[PDB]
Write a protein that binds this ligand. Structure first.
Ligand SMILES: *C(=N)[C@H](C[C@@H]1CCNC1=O)NC(=O)[C@@H]1[C@@H]2[C@H](CN1C(=O)[C@@H](NC(=O)C(F)(F)F)C(C)(C)C)C2(C)C
Ligand SMILES: *C(=N)[C@H](C[C@@H]1CCNC1=O)NC(=O)[C@@H]1[C@@H]2[C@H](CN1C(=O)[C@@H](NC(=O)C(F)(F)F)C(C)(C)C)C2(C)C
Lengths: 303, 303
């Protein structure tokens, strides 16, 4: 409302990195940077292996010739392979001439990133996601989507933070950083696993209330202030993450761009949690939105 | 197969086309396809020209060298110019080597597309939009955003459908097709203009209810049916667009897939409007979503 919506990074730099990886009858997406392809290690599994894989043993059994990597029409010859945690690394005969400036970063719950959904190494769609407090993401992922990556771009530098591995029974998604470390208490085995009970990202809700004010949505503002302690007692009651002093400092700018003190805005949110929204919406939403970071609000508004 | 998200097309093919166009102190974006840069003609207005510009009189006073066109840090030499409706076409000395397979299409209200928001010829972010029934879009556009484009990329062809020109007093946006013809009764003049009252895109709400069913949710169905006439008589009391026999025909495939007759889903929507969601959500929304088309739903849930 008044010009504020979920925005993904332009995906071009990542599009030029997606490849298809095939091991026997198992196909998924790979990330091609320089002369290495990164993909989920579960590509080395047949359907039955996935039910209870011995990744050490399945990798000893494989050779370079067991991996087919396709970049558009061109087969890349695999000349080496290794595992790092839950990602397979395939050394190829050819460095990606579209490799962007990049790094691998591991993000914290509450942080947002752009997902390039891919199938058969072909980019399909882009959308914004937040790492939930329970380490899941609310993605849109079908069969063959594994190896799709999540990223942020700063100037010309792509920061890769997510590689897609699996779908939990609630329909939410679990994955790794690009070093193959899982976000959350999940394993790359087709076995009964479940998302923990989710919590709301308090600092992101406050950020979005700041976005509402900057966009002229002020009905929820009030004369009242509060303390972290009273507010955190409300937060806890309503399955909201504790608000930390560090969260307040991060919101500092917006507290000035709007001249409303975080603990002043905390009074609005407490009131909204206690008394609800009263038929009114905020930036077009009837729900309190927690998938915009303070950075995201500034990026989109002040940017 | 439970996750559903507003998903944009991967933007790489359009990113390679975005340039900066400057005339005097006025800078905005251009679309560089082969040896032509397409941009809003209002780049040739000064501060003084905004209320009642005569574009024919402003343009005839310009030389090729008055147009500064920048592709990254490379200056493109303008060797020609013409005006077509509200678009300027700048002939440059260099065909864009990144030109994708493209066409120009004029869309109807209800149609969706991806927007690549740009500033100074630099892509900023990508989001999904729909042409509203009142010929506006609910975009997120700031100063310098004019000449940002809307597109689809069904089947490796980029279809350019929108070029951004202006913001209306309610915060909605107005622009042209790539032939420079405005969507709606708008003019590229800082004259008192206002969006017509807007309506909800009924065929799209129904598509998204079909999406909810495909992804395993049916709580909102009921034992009733409706005539098309009775559906429209109720829906228009909630500011919904009339549903046409064309709309019913368009929903046929989604009807067939789910086993829910179009007019039975219509009966469900009539009850949804009457009752609200009673604390429930549909694909994570507390509101009825109208910016997914029947075609978008088949894209994301299947192909
Ligand atoms: C990668 N190509 C897919 C992506 C999945 C498929 C549908 N939606 C997605 O996001 N990854 C998998 O199929 C992984 C893979 C085996 C099983 N699996 C799952 O995602 C399964 N989920 C789980 O087993 C659970 F619940 F533990 F998360 C499935 C039931 C097929 C959705 C491996 C190795 C974990
Ligand atoms: C292109 N760079 C901008 C994009 C605008 C700026 C703010 N948000 C946007 O979408 N285009 C313009 O500034 C156009 C341009 C003169 C004025 N204008 C407007 O968008 C203005 N609005 C209108 O005149 C109105 F209400 F009629 F739509 C403005 C008040 C600056 C928002 C011209 C030639 C229309």
């Amino acid at each position: 409302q008044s010009g504020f919506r979920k925005m993904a990074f332009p995906s071009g730099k990542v599009e030029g990195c997606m490849v298809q990886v095939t091991c026997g009858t198992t196909t998924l997406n790979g990330l091609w940077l320089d002369d290495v392809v990164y993909c989920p290690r579960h590509v080395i599994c047949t359907s039955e292996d996935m039910l209870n894989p011995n990744y050490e043993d399945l990798l000893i059994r494989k050779s370079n010739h067991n991996f087919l990597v396709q970049a558009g029409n061109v087969q890349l010859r695999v000349i080496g392979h290794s595992m790092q945690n839950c990602v397979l690394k395939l050394k190829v005969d050819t460095a990606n001439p579209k490799t962007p400036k990049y790094k691998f970063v591991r993000i914290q719950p509450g942080q947002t990133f752009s997902v390039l959904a891919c199938y058969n190494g072909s980019p399909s769609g882009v959308y914004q996601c937040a790492m939930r407090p329970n380490f899941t993401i609310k993605g849109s992922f079908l069969n063959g989507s594994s190896g799709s990556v999540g990223f942020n771009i700063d100037y010309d530098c792509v920061s890769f933070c997510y590689m897609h591995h699996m779908e939990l029974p609630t329909g939410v998604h679990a994955g790794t950083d690009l070093e193959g470390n899982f976000y959350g208490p999940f394993v790359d085995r087709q076995t009964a696993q479940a998302a923990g009970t989710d919590t709301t990202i308090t600092v992101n809700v406050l950020a979005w209330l700041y976005a509402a004010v900057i966009n002229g949505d002020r009905w929820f503002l009030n004369r009242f202030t509060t303390t972290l302690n009273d507010f955190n007692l409300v937060a806890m009651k309503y399955n909201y993450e504790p608000l930390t002093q560090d969260h307040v400092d991060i919101l500092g700018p917006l507290s000035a761009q709007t001249g409303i003190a975080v603990l002043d805005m905390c009074a609005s949110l407490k009131e909204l949690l206690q008394n609800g929204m009263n038929g009114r919406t905020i930036l077009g939403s009837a729900l309190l939105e927690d998938e915009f970071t303070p950075f995201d609000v500034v990026r989109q508004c002040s940017g």
